[PDB]
Design a protein around this ligand. Structure first.
Ligand SMILES: O=c1nc(Nc2cccc(Cl)c2)oc2cc(Cl)oc(=O)c12
Lengths: 108, 107
């Protein structure tokens, strides 16, 4: 495992997975349970922290930028699909600032 | 610093000359663009021109500050615009370059 994927796993994933705002992102958006039959029509590449966490556990990624895109897609889906005033956008914004903070200090 | 210098000369240069960068090079003009509700939804406007000026006048203290500004620019676009607007796609494309370039920032 590269230095960077190790960093994304041990520093970034560790910080975001246990955050108090993380629960809505720990598993794929359930459009039935959440009652949103337009979600999969708007968001065509769903993404979530469980998938990224699993992929980091199973050495699915070949480069750090690959794991970094997944994080970006997860956040960007939220800002694209949700109303500007939904609390989830603000939770997503808080997590993403931590993501960016951490990645500013990723090795190499 | 070395991280701020990299964001200026590697990251910002690549993003600035891109064929999709032109809507992001200067602040959104809600008058000239007919968007009288832009500033009611978007309370912190941001744009590459601002970020570049700040890089040049030593406004930033740490790299993460400047990257935070990049993100706000992209997020404002996703939040304000309809999912189907071409500008969302131009944002995502530029944002992938940003993330790629940021992954190779010297620590
Ligand atoms: O991305 C999203 N993920 C979730 N997850 C979620 C929400 C409540 C419980 C559980 Cl266990 C998971 O909630 C959302 C709600 C809405 Cl309206 O839009 C969204 O885009 C998202």
């Amino acid at each position: 495992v590269t230095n960077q994927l190790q960093y994304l796993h041990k520093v970034v994933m560790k910080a975001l997975w246990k955050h108090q705002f993380a629960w809505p992102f720990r598993q794929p958006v359930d459009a039935v349970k959440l009652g949103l039959p337009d979600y999969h029509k708007i968001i065509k590449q769903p993404m979530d922290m469980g998938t990224i966490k699993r992929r980091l556990e199973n050495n699915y990624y070949w480069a750090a930028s690959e794991c970094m895109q997944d994080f970006n897609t997860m956040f960007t889906n939220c800002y694209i699909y949700n109303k500007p005033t939904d609390d989830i956008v603000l939770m997503a914004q808080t997590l993403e600032k931590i993501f960016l903070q951490k990645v500013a200090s990723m090795p190499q």
